[PDB]
C-alpha cells in the first residue's frame, strides 16, 4: 500500500484487485509531468488502462507486473492520443498485449505522433461503448462522456469496486486550470466533464492522469472550471 518506486516509476495500490501506475515526463514549462493509468487484476489476467509517457517507461510497467502479479496481460486500453496515454503503444505491441482505443483516437495516432491501437472502439449515441468492440473487458466499463479534453477522449469505471477513472478529462477539486486546453472542445467541456460523473454515479474514488485520486469533488470542480469556458 502507499507509493511504491520501481524505477523511475511509482505504483499505488487502489483496491485489491487495483493499482494506479505513474510516470514521468519534462515538458518546459510545466516540470516533470505526472501521468497516471491503472492495472486491474481480472481472476487470472491482468488489465491495463493507459500506457506510460514511453516504450521504455511502458515495459517496466510490465516489468512491475511481472514480478507483483506474475499473470499476463489480456489487454490495454488506452485513453486518447496523446503521448502520456498512448506513448507506450510499442512496448505492449512488443510483449504480444492486444490493444484497445477508440476509433476517433486511431485515426488520429498518426498525426499526434503516436502508434495505434490494433482494435478500435465504437460507443452508442449514449457514450457506452458497443460490447463486441470491447470483447473479454471484464470489470472495465467504457464510457465516452462527449468532446472535452479531446474529441476522442474515453474514460472507464472498475465494476466491483468504488474506483473510476476520468484520464485528462478531469482534474482533481483543488486544481487551478484544466492544464491543456490546445486539443479541447471548450464549449462542450462541462457537460462531458457532467456525463462522466453521471455514468458512474457509485463511484466514490475518481482516478486522473495529472492529479492523485481524489473524491467526486473532482468531477464537481472540473465542470465548475469548465463552465467558464463558455
Ligand atoms: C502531453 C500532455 C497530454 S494531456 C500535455 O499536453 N500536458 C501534460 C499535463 C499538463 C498539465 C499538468 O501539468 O497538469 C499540460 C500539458
Ligand atoms: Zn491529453
Ligand atoms: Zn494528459
Redesign the pocket.
Known amino acids: 500500500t502507499g507509493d511504491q518506486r520501481f524505477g523511475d516509476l511509482v505504483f499505488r495500490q487502489l483496491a485489491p484487485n487495483v493499482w494506479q501506475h505513474t510516470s514521468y515526463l519534462d515538458?518546459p514549462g510545466?516540470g516533470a509531468?505526472a501521468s497516471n493509468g491503472l492495472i486491474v487484476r481480472d481472476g487470472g489476467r491482468v488489465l491495463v488502462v493507459d500506457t506510460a509517457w514511453t516504450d521504455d517507461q511502458t515495459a517496466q510497467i510490465l516489468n512491475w507486473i511481472k514480478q507483483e502479479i506474475n499473470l499476463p496481460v489480456a489487454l490495454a486500453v488506452v485513453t486518447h492520443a496523446?503521448?502520456?496515454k498512448m506513448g507506450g503503444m510499442d512496448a505492449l505491441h512488443a510483449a504480444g498485449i492486444a490493444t484497445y482505443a477508440n476509433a476517433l483516437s486511431n485515426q488520429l495516432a498518426p498525426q499526434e505522433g503516436m502508434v495505434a491501437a490494433q482494435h478500435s472502439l465504437t460507443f452508442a449515441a449514449n457514450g457506452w461503448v458497443e460490447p463486441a468492440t470491447a470483447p473479454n473487458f471484464g470489470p472495465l466499463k467504457v464510457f465516452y462522456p462527449g468532446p472535452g479534453?479531446t474529441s476522442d477522449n474515453i474514460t472507464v469505471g472498475i465494476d466491483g469496486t468504488d474506483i473510476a477513472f476520468g484520464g485528462?478529462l478531469i482534474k482533481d477539486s483543488k486544481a487551478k486550470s484544466l492544464?491543456?486546453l490546445g486539443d479541447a472542445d471548450t464549449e462542450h467541456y462541462a457537460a462531458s466533464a457532467r456525463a462522466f460523473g453521471a455514468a458512474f454515479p457509485k463511484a466514490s474514488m475518481i482516478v486522473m492522469?495529472?492529479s492523485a485520486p481524489d473524491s467526486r469533488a473532482a468531477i464537481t470542480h472540473t465542470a465548475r472550471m469548465a463552465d467558464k469556458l463558455r
Open positions: 515538458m510545466f509531468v496523446h503521448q502520456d479534453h485528462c492544464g491543456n492522469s495529472h
